[PDB]
């Protein structure tokens, strides 16, 4: 049922703007886009400084249950923990519901596994103390190798990632079915499916794409696993297709 999977997809969405979301009016318009005739997306994804205006905007439109995700160490995934941590502490202060931190993937590629663990762990400790979810972007498009994708996913999980996330949306490639499969198998194989969710960013543009991606979660974990806590579409050009499946 493409209609059933489309409504399911919509309700899992972390809605983002398709170009750089760098103004109040882009953010306000994003808030309004997240309230559809058939329901709300689970969240929006914005830069930290826009969280208070977004919160007011969501409240004033009668959808205060739409959550706010933001980004830190983003998009570059540098290996400076102090910076990643300070950005994370600021994101929490602004009022974030979730923080997506970029894993230091270039460090991992150069052979440093420790710094990714330390960086994630530092940020998770701040978020958990404040009741904020920490999601970790590993940048599959830049890692490329299945081995490194698995290793970045592994480290993030051991360091306490609440979700593992394919992409920033800011490089050449976002998620693919292949990178989605690899990351979810890590969750499966480590036995951490209760405590770790998955978030494809990019790669999902049509209703048919969303059904396919949800079918991967369904096959690995059963049809009930992919709720809001465990699954989100990080998507900027998917919502129109979903509403149509339900231009």
Q: Residue 215 sits in a domain of what CATH number?
A: 3.20.20.70
Structure tokens at 49: 């400084």
The C-alpha atoms of residue 114 and residue 173 are separated, in whole angstroms, by 26
Overall residue count recorded for the chain in this entry? 247
Q: Which of 115, 124, 132, 127 is nearest to 78 (CA)?
A: 115
Residues in the chain preceding a C-to-N separation beyond 2.5 angstroms (breaks): 246
CB 175 within 8 A of CB 201: yes
- Is the Cβ–Cβ distance between 153 and 135 less than 8 Å? no
Radius of gyration (Cα) for the chain, nearest Å?
Answer: 17
Residue 103, φ and ψ in degrees, nearest 5:
-55, 140
Tokens of 192: 């951490």
User: Is residue 16 within 8 Å of 235, Cβ to Cβ?
Assistant: yes
Range of the domain at 177: 1-247
Q: What's the angle, vertex CA 5, arms to CA 171 and CA 59, rounded to 5?
A: 70
CA distance 216 to 178: 10
Please count the other Cβ atoms lying within 10 Å of the Cβ belonging to residue 158. 14
DSSP letter string, 129-183:
HTT-EEEEE--HHHH-SHHHHHHHHHHHHHTT-SEEES--SSSS----HHHHHHH
Q: Which distant-in-sequence residues (6+ apart) come within 8 Å of 141 by Cβ?
A: 166, 167, 171, 172, 173, 174, 179
- Which H helix or E strand runs over 235? strand 233-235
CA atoms within 13 A on the CB side of 129: 10
Query: Coil, strand or helix: which one is 95?
Result: coil
How is residue 73 written in tokens? Answer: 């160490």
Domain count, the chain: 1
Instruction: Give CA–CA dist 137/156, Å, rounded.
Output: 9
Contact 149, 189 (CB under 8 A): no
Q: Bin 123: left if φ > 0, else alpha if -120 < ψ < 50, else beta.
A: alpha
**What is the C-alpha to C-alpha distance for residues 80 and 212, in angstroms, rounded to an integer?**
37
DSSP code of residue 84: H
Half-sphere exposure of 166 (CA within 13 A, CB side): 32
Helix (H) or strand (E) holding 25: helix 24-33
240, 207, 204: which is closest to 4 by C-alpha?
207
Q: Is 106 exposed, middle or buried (0-12, 13-18, 19+ CB in 10 A)?
A: middle
167: Cβ contacts below 8 Å, ≥ 6 apart: 137, 139, 140, 141, 173, 174, 175, 200, 201, 202, 203, 234
The rounded distance, in Å, linking the Cα atoms of 213 and 66 is 23
């Amino acid at each position: 049922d493409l209609k059933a999977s489309s409504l399911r997809a919509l309700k899992l969405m972390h809605l983002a703007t398709a170009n750089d979301d760098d103004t109040d009016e882009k953010v306000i318009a994003l808030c309004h886009q997240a309230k559809t005739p058939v329901g709300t997306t689970d969240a929006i994804f914005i830069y930290p400084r826009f969280i208070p205006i977004a919160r007011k905007t969501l409240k004033e439109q009668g959808t205060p249950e739409i959550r706010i995700w933001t980004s830190t160490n983003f998009p570059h995934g540098n290996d400076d923990i102090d910076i990643a941590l300070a950005e994370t502490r600021a994101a929490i202060a602004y009022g974030a519901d979730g923080v997506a931190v970029v894993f230091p993937y270039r460090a991992l590629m150069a052979g440093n596994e420790q710094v990714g663990f330390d960086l994630v762990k530092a940020c998770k400790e701040a978020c958990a103390a404040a009741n904020v979810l920490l999601s970790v972007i590993i940048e599959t498009g830049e890692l490329k190798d299945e081995a490194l994708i698995r290793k970045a996913s592994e480290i993030s999980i051991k360091a306490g990632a609440d979700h593992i996330v394919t992409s920033t949306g800011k490089v050449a490639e976002g998620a693919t079915p292949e990178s989605a499969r690899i990351m979810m198998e890590v969750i499966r194989d480590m036995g951490v499916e209760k405590t770790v969710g998955f978030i494809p960013v990019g790669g999902v543009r049509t209703a048919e794409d969303a059904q396919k991606y949800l079918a991967i979660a369904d096959e690995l974990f059963g049809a009930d696993w992919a709720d809001a806590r465990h699954y989100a579409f990080g998507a900027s050009s998917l919502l129109a297709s979903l509403l149509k499946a339900l231009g």
